[model samples]
Target chain A: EFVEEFNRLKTFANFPSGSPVSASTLARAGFLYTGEGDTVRCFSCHAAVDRWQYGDSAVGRHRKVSPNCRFINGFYLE
Target chain B: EFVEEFNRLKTFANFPSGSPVSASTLARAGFLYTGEGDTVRCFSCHAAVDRWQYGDSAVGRHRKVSPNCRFINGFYLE
Candidate 1:
């Protein structure tokens, strides 16, 4: 399921090309695009995060804002 | 891919039961659970939205915020 979402994000034509975070990175962090901007949300905890700047970590931001999320806590890993 | 994400959301253990929107509804609107709260993002546009109250229309919100989203624009319908 995560892979499928990842593929969608990877191929999403509207995804910001200049964003620091890659689709694979966001997907691995358990995120899916929200179709607005560079925003993404966790599939398990519903933690919405966006505005990824250079040197930012998708997983790190996910953990910082939603540490209890199952996806980040290793509940659903690919 | 949309169905798979929808299924994940449908079976999500932590999904708020009181949310006004249903998994099927959100899926149809091209959204996937973000795993933090009731927040969900459109798979095509990456629009992160949450805090659903009664009478909230998932599709309506998606269209309103991301009218150009391929999913809502009838590009990736099921």
Candidate 2:
């Protein structure tokens, strides 16, 4: 249900849903698209992604940096 | 002229033009309204204000924490 927020934000909130980044990418993975053109933010952890290369799998990049994102697999933080 | 950017943003961008905060309060203090209810960002320093108490002066608080904000005084950083 948390990921549901992206539906409205991506379509209507003027968020760039992975343009050259990828459609089934960042937003599909769970990051809230920032209006800042390329920066995508994790709504749960508030970790704003600053560096991303073309064709990079956002999920892989997110896991690489924030290993413990509650939304990342079963790695929940209490 | 930097402050002029606020005129369009505050008027059209749905950014809260200082309501529970104050219009002349933050916007006058040179902070860009974040559209996030209460958070404001410094255009020059990019310092996002996370803490604010009622009746608190935003500029005073900004000056207290980000003493080096180029917009703060003449203490500019190259």
Candidate 3:
């Protein structure tokens, strides 16, 4: 249920060690680094995602809050 | 039709000169500077606002894309 192709997008996912979520996981879920420590930004909506915790559902939470985000639609860059 | 009071929230809206919008103008519409030039973050949805244009409606755009943003719900810090 995930893209699983973002593993190679190293520059997009860069987080501090011991952070709640891995940058790779976030990148797979459409989040990208904002050049700030652990302050990821969503590509589709450009929303900042922080206060992350282990086991948090970035995709689900994004849909819940920004339902109209382009990434939520059927079409997104693949 | 505007906050008209964010002129004092200097830090919230910091943008480069000749940009389409002013930092004070964005701050009035609930955007805070992300400490990056001209890239403002929304206080309610944590969304980044860029590629801004003159006469842009930040509030309206936020409501359109992220209707669930707390600021649009009428209950937020004042």
Candidate 4:
């Protein structure tokens, strides 16, 4: 996880699913999640920063799978 | 996993995190994610014509959750 902030991501729950958390709500915090069964680091790190953001835009628009986010310090902003 | 209707919920992703899917989109489909390890359940269950719709009077006012719905089948409307 890229963020060490715990309470922040949990706070995302406060907004519910319909509303996207604001950049301000994050205070620079970003959403985070990591998958390991495949045995690798986050997909985000696999590519460059801009690429990762591009990919996220696509996933956000086309996934029913659970949310996956950028993780840094072990926590994410929901 | 309630409806066994995979494609629908995937559609939910199209709206991204900011938009809520419409009930009509479900077409009788509901969101379902069963974490049982498939191990017999203490909390996993169904959808109704009206009941689950009315879950928690406060949910309407305060939302932000993975949509949980009553299931009979395996897929959910996203």
| Local distance difference test values of all predictions, in order | 0.72, 0.60, 0.61, 0.28
lDDT of 1 by residue, A1-78 (tens): 443342434334466768888766787677877878999887789889987999999889999999899867776444
lDDT value, residue A11 of candidate 3: 39
Q: lDDT tens digits, residues A1-78, model 4?
A: 233222123222232222333312232333322221211123333321211322233234212222444443334334
**Candidate 2 per-residue lDDT over residues A1-78, each given as its tens digit:** 234432313322454544556533666566776667677777666777756777778888888878877777644333
RMSD of each: 14.2, 14.7, 14.8, 15.9
Q: What level of docking quality does candidate 2 show?
A: incorrect
> Number of clashes in model 3?
0
Instruction: Name the top lDDT candidate.
Output: 1
The local lDDT score (0 to 100) that residue A64 gets in candidate 3 is 67
Q: Any runs in candidate 4 off by more than 4 Å, and if so which?
A: A1-38, A47-70, B1-3, B7-19, B22-44, B47-78
- Top DockQ model: 1
lDDT of 3 by residue, B7-29 (tens): 32566533577777766556755
- Preferred candidate (TM-score higher): 3 or 4: 3
Q: For model 1 chain A, give the 10-residue run with minimal summed lDDT.
A: A2-11
What's the distance in Å from true for residue B61, model 3? 38
What TM-score would you give candidate 1 relative to the actual structure?
A: 0.45
Q: What is the DockQ of each candidate?
A: 0.03, 0.02, 0.02, 0.02
